From Swiss-Prot, chain C:
Domain of life: Eukaryota
Descriptive protein name: 14-3-3 protein zeta/delta
Gene3D superfamilies per UniProt: 14-3-3 domain (1.20.190.20)
Family designation: Belongs to the 14-3-3 family.
Source organism (scientific name): Homo sapiens
GO cellular component: blood microparticle; cytoplasm; cytosol; extracellular exosome; extracellular space; focal adhesion; glutamatergic synapse; hippocampal mossy fiber to CA3 synapse
Curated annotation (Swiss-Prot), chain D:
Compartments reported by the entry: Cytoplasm; Nucleus
Span covered, complete protein: 147 to 155 of 634
Protein name per UniProt: CREB-regulated transcription coactivator 1
Modified how: Phosphorylation/dephosphorylation states of Ser-5 are required for regulating transduction of CREB activity. TORCs are inactive when phosphorylated, and active when dephosphorylated at this site. This primary site of phosphorylation is mediated by SIKs (SIK1 and SIK2), is regulated by cAMP and calcium levels and is dependent on the phosphorylation of SIKs by LKB1.
Known disease link: A chromosomal aberration involving CRTC1 is found in mucoepidermoid carcinomas, benign Warthin tumors and clear cell hidradenomas. Translocation t(11;19)(q21;p13) with MAML2. The fusion protein consists of the N-terminus of CRTC1 joined to the C-terminus of MAML2. The reciprocal fusion protein consisting of the N-terminus of MAML2 joined to the C-terminus of CRTC1 has been detected in a small number of mucoepidermoid carcinomas.
Protein backbone atom coordinates (compact mmCIF):
# COMPACT_ATOMS: atom_id res chain seq x y z
CA UNK A 1 0.00 0.00 0.00
CA UNK A 2 0.90 3.64 0.44
CA UNK A 3 4.11 3.90 2.44
CA UNK A 4 2.21 6.05 4.96
CA UNK A 5 -0.66 3.54 5.09
CA UNK A 6 1.72 0.68 5.89
CA UNK A 7 3.25 2.80 8.66
CA UNK A 8 -0.23 3.50 10.05
CA UNK A 9 -0.99 -0.23 10.09
CA UNK A 10 2.34 -0.90 11.82
CA UNK A 11 1.37 1.49 14.63
CA UNK A 12 -2.02 -0.24 14.88
CA UNK A 13 -0.34 -3.66 15.02
CA UNK A 14 2.01 -2.35 17.72
CA UNK A 15 -0.86 -1.19 19.95
CA UNK A 16 -2.49 -4.61 19.47
CA UNK A 17 0.83 -6.31 20.35
CA UNK A 18 0.73 -8.18 17.03
CA UNK A 19 4.41 -7.86 16.18
CA UNK A 20 4.46 -10.32 13.28
CA UNK A 21 1.94 -8.02 11.58
CA UNK A 22 3.99 -4.98 12.61
CA UNK A 23 7.22 -6.40 11.17
CA UNK A 24 5.50 -7.46 7.94
CA UNK A 25 4.36 -3.87 7.36
CA UNK A 26 7.75 -2.33 8.11
CA UNK A 27 9.52 -4.92 5.96
CA UNK A 28 7.18 -3.84 3.15
CA UNK A 29 7.99 -0.18 3.86
CA UNK A 30 11.73 -0.90 3.72
CA UNK A 31 11.45 -2.88 0.47
CA UNK A 32 10.06 0.23 -1.25
CA UNK A 33 13.70 1.35 -1.40
CA UNK A 34 13.49 4.82 0.14
CA UNK A 35 15.52 5.94 3.14
CA UNK A 36 13.52 5.41 6.32
CA UNK A 37 12.41 8.32 8.45
CA UNK A 38 13.41 8.18 12.11
CA UNK A 39 9.83 7.18 13.01
CA UNK A 40 9.74 4.41 10.40
CA UNK A 41 13.22 3.28 11.45
CA UNK A 42 12.09 2.98 15.08
CA UNK A 43 8.96 1.06 14.08
CA UNK A 44 11.04 -1.43 12.09
CA UNK A 45 13.46 -1.80 15.01
CA UNK A 46 10.74 -2.29 17.64
CA UNK A 47 8.81 -4.80 15.50
CA UNK A 48 11.72 -7.16 14.85
CA UNK A 49 13.04 -6.71 18.40
CA UNK A 50 9.76 -8.20 19.63
CA UNK A 51 9.51 -10.91 16.96
CA UNK A 52 13.04 -12.20 17.56
CA UNK A 53 12.78 -11.56 21.30
CA UNK A 54 9.99 -14.11 21.68
CA UNK A 55 12.14 -16.77 20.00
CA UNK A 56 15.19 -15.83 22.08
CA UNK A 57 13.12 -16.12 25.26
CA UNK A 58 11.64 -19.50 24.31
CA UNK A 59 15.06 -20.77 23.17
CA UNK A 60 16.60 -20.05 26.57
CA UNK A 61 13.78 -21.94 28.31
CA UNK A 62 13.96 -25.07 26.14
CA UNK A 63 17.76 -25.18 26.06
CA UNK A 64 17.85 -25.06 29.86
CA UNK A 65 15.34 -27.93 30.06
CA UNK A 66 17.52 -29.96 27.69
CA UNK A 67 20.51 -29.43 30.02
CA UNK A 68 18.52 -30.29 33.17
CA UNK A 69 17.34 -33.63 31.77
CA UNK A 70 16.92 -39.40 27.49
CA UNK A 71 13.64 -39.55 25.59
CA UNK A 72 12.82 -36.21 27.23
CA UNK A 73 16.23 -34.79 26.25
CA UNK A 74 15.86 -35.56 22.53
CA UNK A 75 12.31 -34.20 22.61
CA UNK A 76 13.63 -30.89 23.94
CA UNK A 77 16.50 -30.89 21.44
CA UNK A 78 14.17 -31.19 18.46
CA UNK A 79 11.98 -28.42 19.88
CA UNK A 80 14.99 -26.16 20.49
CA UNK A 81 16.10 -26.76 16.90
CA UNK A 82 12.62 -25.83 15.64
CA UNK A 83 12.78 -22.53 17.55
CA UNK A 84 16.34 -22.00 16.32
CA UNK A 85 15.16 -22.30 12.71
CA UNK A 86 12.49 -19.67 13.36
CA UNK A 87 15.07 -17.48 15.10
CA UNK A 88 17.64 -17.79 12.31
CA UNK A 89 15.03 -17.04 9.64
CA UNK A 90 14.02 -13.88 11.52
CA UNK A 91 17.60 -12.64 11.83
CA UNK A 92 18.42 -13.48 8.21
CA UNK A 93 15.39 -11.43 7.14
CA UNK A 94 16.65 -8.43 9.13
CA UNK A 95 20.25 -8.77 7.97
CA UNK A 96 19.11 -8.95 4.33
CA UNK A 97 17.09 -5.73 4.67
CA UNK A 98 20.18 -4.15 6.24
CA UNK A 99 22.54 -5.24 3.45
CA UNK A 100 20.15 -4.47 0.59
CA UNK A 101 18.33 -1.28 1.67
CA UNK A 102 19.14 0.30 5.03
CA UNK A 103 22.94 0.44 5.21
CA UNK A 104 23.55 1.48 1.55
CA UNK A 105 20.82 4.17 1.71
CA UNK A 106 21.87 5.70 5.04
CA UNK A 107 22.97 9.29 4.33
CA UNK A 108 23.91 10.52 7.83
CA UNK A 109 26.28 9.11 10.46
CA UNK A 110 23.46 8.85 13.04
CA UNK A 111 21.35 6.56 10.85
CA UNK A 112 24.47 4.60 9.75
CA UNK A 113 25.52 4.06 13.38
CA UNK A 114 21.94 2.91 14.02
CA UNK A 115 21.87 0.30 11.26
CA UNK A 116 25.40 -0.99 11.83
CA UNK A 117 24.47 -1.48 15.49
CA UNK A 118 21.40 -3.40 14.31
CA UNK A 119 23.65 -5.55 12.12
CA UNK A 120 25.85 -6.29 15.13
CA UNK A 121 22.74 -7.11 17.17
CA UNK A 122 21.19 -9.65 14.82
CA UNK A 123 24.49 -11.36 14.07
CA UNK A 124 24.92 -11.52 17.86
CA UNK A 125 21.54 -13.26 18.16
CA UNK A 126 22.72 -15.67 15.46
CA UNK A 127 25.87 -16.26 17.50
CA UNK A 128 23.78 -16.93 20.62
CA UNK A 129 22.57 -20.17 18.97
CA UNK A 130 25.44 -20.87 16.58
CA UNK A 131 27.67 -23.89 17.15
CA UNK A 132 30.20 -25.90 15.21
CA UNK A 133 32.27 -24.20 12.54
CA UNK A 134 29.78 -21.44 11.67
CA UNK A 135 30.13 -19.64 15.01
CA UNK A 136 33.52 -17.95 14.61
CA UNK A 137 32.47 -16.44 11.28
CA UNK A 138 29.15 -15.20 12.68
CA UNK A 139 30.80 -13.80 15.82
CA UNK A 140 33.38 -11.90 13.76
CA UNK A 141 30.58 -10.51 11.58
CA UNK A 142 28.89 -9.14 14.70
CA UNK A 143 32.14 -7.67 16.04
CA UNK A 144 33.01 -5.92 12.76
CA UNK A 145 29.57 -4.32 12.50
CA UNK A 146 29.76 -3.07 16.10
CA UNK A 147 33.35 -1.87 15.65
CA UNK A 148 32.58 0.27 12.59
CA UNK A 149 29.52 1.73 14.31
CA UNK A 150 31.63 2.34 17.42
CA UNK A 151 34.27 4.29 15.49
CA UNK A 152 31.76 6.45 13.60
CA UNK A 153 29.80 7.18 16.79
CA UNK A 154 32.91 8.31 18.68
CA UNK A 155 33.84 10.79 15.93
CA UNK A 156 30.44 12.21 14.92
CA UNK A 157 28.27 11.92 18.05
CA UNK A 158 28.51 13.35 21.54
CA UNK A 159 28.96 11.00 24.53
CA UNK A 160 25.35 11.63 25.55
CA UNK A 161 23.70 10.78 22.22
CA UNK A 162 21.29 7.89 22.97
CA UNK A 163 22.32 6.04 19.80
CA UNK A 164 26.00 6.25 20.76
CA UNK A 165 25.13 5.15 24.31
CA UNK A 166 22.93 2.29 23.12
CA UNK A 167 25.71 1.06 20.84
CA UNK A 168 28.23 1.05 23.69
CA UNK A 169 25.69 -0.84 25.81
CA UNK A 170 25.13 -3.61 23.25
CA UNK A 171 28.81 -3.73 22.24
CA UNK A 172 29.77 -4.30 25.88
CA UNK A 173 27.07 -6.99 26.07
CA UNK A 174 28.61 -8.59 22.97
CA UNK A 175 31.99 -8.64 24.71
CA UNK A 176 30.57 -10.13 27.91
CA UNK A 177 28.24 -12.80 26.51
CA UNK A 178 29.65 -13.76 23.09
CA UNK A 179 33.40 -13.21 23.39
CA UNK A 180 33.44 -14.08 27.12
CA UNK A 181 35.68 -11.05 27.73
CA UNK A 182 34.39 -9.53 31.00
CA UNK A 183 37.17 -6.95 31.45
CA UNK A 184 36.73 -5.43 27.99
CA UNK A 185 32.96 -5.37 28.62
CA UNK A 186 33.28 -3.35 31.83
CA UNK A 187 36.01 -1.15 30.35
CA UNK A 188 33.75 -0.22 27.43
CA UNK A 189 30.69 0.31 29.64
CA UNK A 190 32.49 2.35 32.31
CA UNK A 191 34.00 4.71 29.72
CA UNK A 192 30.65 5.31 28.00
CA UNK A 193 28.94 5.98 31.33
CA UNK A 194 31.72 8.20 32.71
CA UNK A 195 32.07 10.22 29.51
CA UNK A 196 28.30 10.78 29.50
CA UNK A 197 28.30 11.77 33.19
CA UNK A 198 31.05 14.31 32.47
CA UNK A 199 28.88 16.01 29.83
CA UNK A 200 25.43 16.00 31.41
CA UNK A 201 24.99 19.78 31.26
CA UNK A 202 24.88 19.59 27.38
CA UNK A 203 21.85 17.30 26.83
CA UNK A 204 18.75 17.96 24.74
CA UNK A 205 16.93 12.89 24.94
CA UNK A 206 17.38 13.32 28.70
CA UNK A 207 15.51 10.20 29.77
CA UNK A 208 16.43 8.24 26.63
CA UNK A 209 20.15 8.69 27.29
CA UNK A 210 19.91 8.46 31.08
CA UNK A 211 17.93 5.21 30.81
CA UNK A 212 20.78 3.68 28.81
CA UNK A 213 23.27 5.07 31.34
CA UNK A 214 21.35 3.27 34.09
CA UNK A 215 21.56 0.00 32.14
CA UNK A 216 25.30 0.51 31.64
CA UNK A 217 25.84 0.92 35.39
CA UNK A 218 23.49 -1.95 36.25
CA UNK A 219 25.49 -4.23 33.95
CA UNK A 220 28.75 -2.92 35.44
CA UNK A 221 27.59 -3.81 38.96
CA UNK A 222 26.42 -7.28 37.89
CA UNK A 223 29.57 -8.08 35.91
CA UNK A 224 31.86 -6.77 38.65
CA UNK A 225 30.00 -8.95 41.16
CA UNK B 1 19.80 -13.74 32.24
CA UNK B 2 20.21 -10.58 34.32
CA UNK B 3 22.42 -8.78 31.79
CA UNK B 4 20.51 -6.14 29.86
CA UNK B 5 20.82 -4.85 26.31
CA UNK B 6 19.26 -1.79 24.67
CA UNK B 7 16.15 -3.84 23.84
CA UNK B 8 15.00 -3.40 27.46
CA UNK B 9 13.94 0.17 26.52
CA UNK B 10 11.80 -0.39 23.41
CA UNK C 1 1.95 -41.05 20.27
CA UNK C 2 -0.35 -39.37 22.80
CA UNK C 3 2.20 -39.08 25.61
CA UNK C 4 4.73 -37.65 23.18
CA UNK C 5 2.17 -35.00 22.18
CA UNK C 6 1.31 -34.30 25.84
CA UNK C 7 5.07 -34.08 26.62
CA UNK C 8 5.65 -31.66 23.77
CA UNK C 9 2.61 -29.63 24.84
CA UNK C 10 4.18 -29.14 28.27
CA UNK C 11 7.36 -28.02 26.51
CA UNK C 12 5.40 -25.49 24.44
CA UNK C 13 3.73 -24.12 27.58
CA UNK C 14 7.07 -23.56 29.30
CA UNK C 15 8.28 -21.77 26.16
CA UNK C 16 5.08 -19.66 26.13
CA UNK C 17 4.37 -20.92 22.59
CA UNK C 18 0.66 -21.48 23.02
CA UNK C 19 -0.20 -22.11 19.36
CA UNK C 20 2.17 -25.09 19.47
CA UNK C 21 0.66 -26.17 22.80
CA UNK C 22 -2.89 -26.05 21.42
CA UNK C 23 -1.98 -27.94 18.24
CA UNK C 24 -0.61 -30.82 20.32
CA UNK C 25 -3.65 -31.05 22.59
CA UNK C 26 -6.00 -30.74 19.61
CA UNK C 27 -4.18 -33.74 18.11
CA UNK C 28 -4.45 -35.66 21.39
CA UNK C 29 -8.18 -34.94 21.62
CA UNK C 30 -8.75 -36.04 18.01
CA UNK C 31 -7.50 -39.51 18.98
CA UNK C 32 -11.02 -39.95 20.38
CA UNK C 33 -10.27 -41.13 23.94
CA UNK C 34 -11.36 -39.35 27.12
CA UNK C 35 -8.77 -36.83 28.28
CA UNK C 36 -6.95 -37.20 31.58
CA UNK C 37 -7.32 -34.39 34.10
CA UNK C 38 -3.76 -33.39 33.19
CA UNK C 39 -4.55 -33.48 29.46
CA UNK C 40 -7.81 -31.59 30.05
CA UNK C 41 -5.99 -28.76 31.84
CA UNK C 42 -3.30 -28.55 29.16
CA UNK C 43 -5.96 -28.26 26.44
CA UNK C 44 -7.86 -25.62 28.43
CA UNK C 45 -4.73 -23.62 29.28
CA UNK C 46 -3.49 -23.73 25.68
CA UNK C 47 -6.65 -22.35 24.07
CA UNK C 48 -7.30 -19.88 26.90
CA UNK C 49 -3.98 -18.25 25.98
CA UNK C 50 -4.49 -18.63 22.22
CA UNK C 51 -7.92 -17.00 22.23
CA UNK C 52 -6.93 -14.58 25.00
CA UNK C 53 -4.35 -12.88 22.80
CA UNK C 54 -6.96 -12.23 20.11
CA UNK C 55 -9.53 -11.04 22.66
CA UNK C 56 -6.96 -8.60 24.07
CA UNK C 57 -5.95 -7.31 20.63
CA UNK C 58 -9.63 -6.99 19.70
CA UNK C 59 -10.34 -4.85 22.77
CA UNK C 60 -7.48 -2.51 21.83
CA UNK C 61 -8.41 -2.11 18.16
CA UNK C 62 -12.15 -1.81 18.82
CA UNK C 63 -11.46 0.99 21.31
CA UNK C 64 -9.27 2.77 18.75
CA UNK C 65 -12.10 2.38 16.22
CA UNK C 66 -14.39 4.17 18.69
CA UNK C 67 -12.04 7.11 19.40
CA UNK C 68 -11.42 7.85 15.70
CA UNK C 69 -14.99 8.92 14.95
CA UNK C 70 -14.66 11.79 12.51
CA UNK C 71 -11.21 10.50 11.44
CA UNK C 72 -12.27 8.59 8.34
CA UNK C 73 -9.00 6.92 7.31
CA UNK C 74 -8.03 5.91 10.85
CA UNK C 75 -11.49 4.53 11.64
CA UNK C 76 -11.71 2.43 8.48
CA UNK C 77 -8.23 1.00 9.08
CA UNK C 78 -9.15 0.06 12.66
CA UNK C 79 -12.44 -1.44 11.45
CA UNK C 80 -10.74 -3.62 8.84
CA UNK C 81 -8.05 -4.68 11.31
CA UNK C 82 -10.68 -5.53 13.94
CA UNK C 83 -12.42 -7.71 11.35
CA UNK C 84 -9.10 -9.43 10.58
CA UNK C 85 -8.64 -10.14 14.29
CA UNK C 86 -12.26 -11.30 14.60
CA UNK C 87 -11.76 -13.89 11.85
CA UNK C 88 -8.76 -15.35 13.70
CA UNK C 89 -10.80 -15.35 16.92
CA UNK C 90 -13.81 -17.09 15.35
CA UNK C 91 -11.67 -19.85 13.83
CA UNK C 92 -10.07 -20.52 17.24
CA UNK C 93 -13.40 -20.84 19.04
CA UNK C 94 -14.96 -22.93 16.28
CA UNK C 95 -12.03 -25.34 16.60
CA UNK C 96 -12.60 -25.54 20.37
CA UNK C 97 -16.38 -25.86 20.04
CA UNK C 98 -15.86 -28.63 17.48
CA UNK C 99 -13.58 -30.56 19.85
CA UNK C 100 -16.18 -30.12 22.60
CA UNK C 101 -19.12 -31.34 20.51
CA UNK C 102 -17.29 -34.25 18.86
CA UNK C 103 -15.03 -35.60 21.63
CA UNK C 104 -14.97 -33.86 25.00
CA UNK C 105 -18.65 -33.58 25.97
CA UNK C 106 -19.68 -37.01 24.55
CA UNK C 107 -16.71 -38.72 26.24
CA UNK C 108 -17.27 -37.11 29.66
CA UNK C 109 -18.05 -39.98 32.02
CA UNK C 110 -18.02 -38.04 35.31
CA UNK C 111 -20.21 -35.17 36.46
CA UNK C 112 -17.16 -33.00 37.18
CA UNK C 113 -15.90 -33.40 33.61
CA UNK C 114 -19.36 -32.71 32.15
CA UNK C 115 -19.56 -29.45 34.13
CA UNK C 116 -16.03 -28.49 33.07
CA UNK C 117 -16.62 -28.99 29.35
CA UNK C 118 -20.15 -27.55 29.31
CA UNK C 119 -18.74 -24.47 31.06
CA UNK C 120 -16.01 -24.39 28.42
CA UNK C 121 -18.71 -24.52 25.73
CA UNK C 122 -20.43 -21.58 27.39
CA UNK C 123 -17.11 -19.74 27.53
CA UNK C 124 -16.18 -20.03 23.87
CA UNK C 125 -19.70 -19.24 22.70
CA UNK C 126 -19.45 -16.17 24.95
CA UNK C 127 -16.27 -15.16 23.11
CA UNK C 128 -18.13 -15.58 19.82
CA UNK C 129 -20.94 -13.38 21.16
CA UNK C 130 -18.45 -10.64 22.09
CA UNK C 131 -17.71 -10.21 18.35
CA UNK C 132 -20.90 -11.50 16.69
CA UNK C 133 -22.70 -9.58 13.95
CA UNK C 134 -26.27 -8.33 14.29
CA UNK C 135 -28.29 -11.26 12.98
CA UNK C 136 -25.97 -14.00 14.29
CA UNK C 137 -25.73 -12.64 17.84
CA UNK C 138 -28.95 -13.77 19.52
CA UNK C 139 -28.43 -17.37 18.41
CA UNK C 140 -24.83 -17.39 19.63
CA UNK C 141 -25.88 -15.80 22.94
CA UNK C 142 -28.56 -18.46 23.44
CA UNK C 143 -26.01 -21.22 22.78
CA UNK C 144 -23.70 -19.87 25.49
CA UNK C 145 -26.59 -19.44 27.94
CA UNK C 146 -27.83 -22.98 27.34
CA UNK C 147 -24.36 -24.46 27.86
CA UNK C 148 -23.81 -22.51 31.08
CA UNK C 149 -27.30 -23.37 32.33
CA UNK C 150 -26.85 -27.11 31.79
CA UNK C 151 -23.45 -26.99 33.51
CA UNK C 152 -25.03 -24.87 36.25
CA UNK C 153 -27.77 -27.41 36.97
CA UNK C 154 -25.38 -30.38 37.07
CA UNK C 155 -22.92 -28.51 39.30
CA UNK C 156 -25.62 -27.56 41.82
CA UNK C 157 -26.80 -31.19 41.97
CA UNK C 158 -23.47 -33.06 42.09
CA UNK C 159 -20.88 -30.66 43.58
CA UNK C 160 -20.51 -28.91 46.91
CA UNK C 161 -20.72 -25.09 46.96
CA UNK C 162 -16.94 -24.84 47.50
CA UNK C 163 -15.89 -26.91 44.50
CA UNK C 164 -13.64 -24.65 42.38
CA UNK C 165 -15.24 -25.83 39.13
CA UNK C 166 -18.70 -25.01 40.49
CA UNK C 167 -17.36 -21.67 41.75
CA UNK C 168 -15.58 -20.93 38.48
CA UNK C 169 -18.75 -21.69 36.53
CA UNK C 170 -20.75 -19.29 38.71
CA UNK C 171 -18.06 -16.66 38.14
CA UNK C 172 -18.16 -16.93 34.34
CA UNK C 173 -21.95 -17.37 34.20
CA UNK C 174 -22.37 -14.16 36.20
CA UNK C 175 -19.90 -12.47 33.84
CA UNK C 176 -22.04 -13.69 30.94
CA UNK C 177 -25.11 -12.03 32.45
CA UNK C 178 -23.31 -8.74 33.11
CA UNK C 179 -21.31 -8.38 29.90
CA UNK C 180 -23.34 -10.25 27.27
CA UNK C 181 -26.94 -9.97 28.50
CA UNK C 182 -26.44 -6.57 30.22
CA UNK C 183 -28.40 -7.84 33.23
CA UNK C 184 -26.44 -6.59 36.27
CA UNK C 185 -29.07 -7.61 38.83
CA UNK C 186 -29.04 -11.24 37.69
CA UNK C 187 -25.24 -11.11 37.50
CA UNK C 188 -24.96 -9.89 41.09
CA UNK C 189 -27.62 -12.34 42.31
CA UNK C 190 -25.78 -15.28 40.75
CA UNK C 191 -22.41 -14.15 42.11
CA UNK C 192 -23.72 -13.32 45.59
CA UNK C 193 -25.52 -16.66 45.94
CA UNK C 194 -22.42 -18.62 44.91
CA UNK C 195 -20.31 -16.71 47.44
CA UNK C 196 -22.84 -17.10 50.26
CA UNK C 197 -23.42 -20.81 49.62
CA UNK C 198 -19.66 -21.42 49.76
CA UNK C 199 -19.38 -19.46 53.01
CA UNK C 200 -22.18 -21.57 54.52
CA UNK C 201 -20.20 -24.72 53.64
CA UNK C 202 -16.55 -24.09 54.38
CA UNK C 203 -16.18 -27.64 55.72
CA UNK C 204 -15.96 -29.04 52.16
CA UNK C 205 -12.42 -27.96 51.43
CA UNK C 206 -9.42 -30.06 50.43
CA UNK C 207 -5.78 -29.04 50.85
CA UNK C 208 -5.30 -29.37 47.10
CA UNK C 209 -8.07 -26.93 46.17
CA UNK C 210 -9.02 -24.83 49.21
CA UNK C 211 -6.63 -22.19 47.89
CA UNK C 212 -8.32 -22.21 44.48
CA UNK C 213 -11.83 -21.98 45.95
CA UNK C 214 -11.01 -18.95 48.09
CA UNK C 215 -9.32 -17.21 45.15
CA UNK C 216 -12.47 -17.59 43.03
CA UNK C 217 -14.61 -16.43 45.96
CA UNK C 218 -12.55 -13.24 46.13
CA UNK C 219 -13.05 -12.73 42.39
CA UNK C 220 -16.80 -13.24 42.80
CA UNK C 221 -16.97 -10.56 45.49
CA UNK C 222 -14.67 -8.20 43.58
CA UNK C 223 -17.07 -8.34 40.63
CA UNK C 224 -19.97 -7.91 43.07
CA UNK C 225 -18.34 -4.74 44.41
CA UNK C 226 -17.60 -3.38 40.93
CA UNK C 227 -21.08 -4.07 39.54
CA UNK C 228 -22.71 -2.47 42.61
CA UNK C 229 -20.96 0.88 42.02
CA UNK D 1 -12.40 -3.86 31.55
CA UNK D 2 -12.21 -4.44 35.30
CA UNK D 3 -14.64 -7.37 35.44
CA UNK D 4 -12.86 -10.69 35.94
CA UNK D 5 -13.70 -14.13 34.62
CA UNK D 6 -12.05 -17.41 35.59
CA UNK D 7 -9.17 -16.64 33.20
CA UNK D 8 -7.81 -14.29 35.91
CA UNK D 9 -6.49 -17.45 37.56
Amino acid sequence: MDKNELVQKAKLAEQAERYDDMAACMKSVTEQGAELSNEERNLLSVAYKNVVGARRSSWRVVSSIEQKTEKKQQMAREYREKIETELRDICNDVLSLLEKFLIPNASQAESKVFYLKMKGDYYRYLAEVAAGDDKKGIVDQSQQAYQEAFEISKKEMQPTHPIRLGLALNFSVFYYEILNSPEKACSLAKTAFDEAIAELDTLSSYKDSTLIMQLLRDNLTLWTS
Amino acid sequence: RRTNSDSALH
